[PDB]
């Protein structure tokens, strides 16, 4: 399975959106 990684992912991302 490549759900828990591939949401854990969009986390990560998040931020790098919220702080540009």
């Known amino acids: ?3 828990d990684v591939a949401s854990e ?3 990560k ?8």
């Open 1 to 3: 399975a490549r759900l």
């Open 9 to 11: 992912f969009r986390k």
């Open 13 to 20: 991302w998040n931020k790098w959106a919220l702080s540009r």
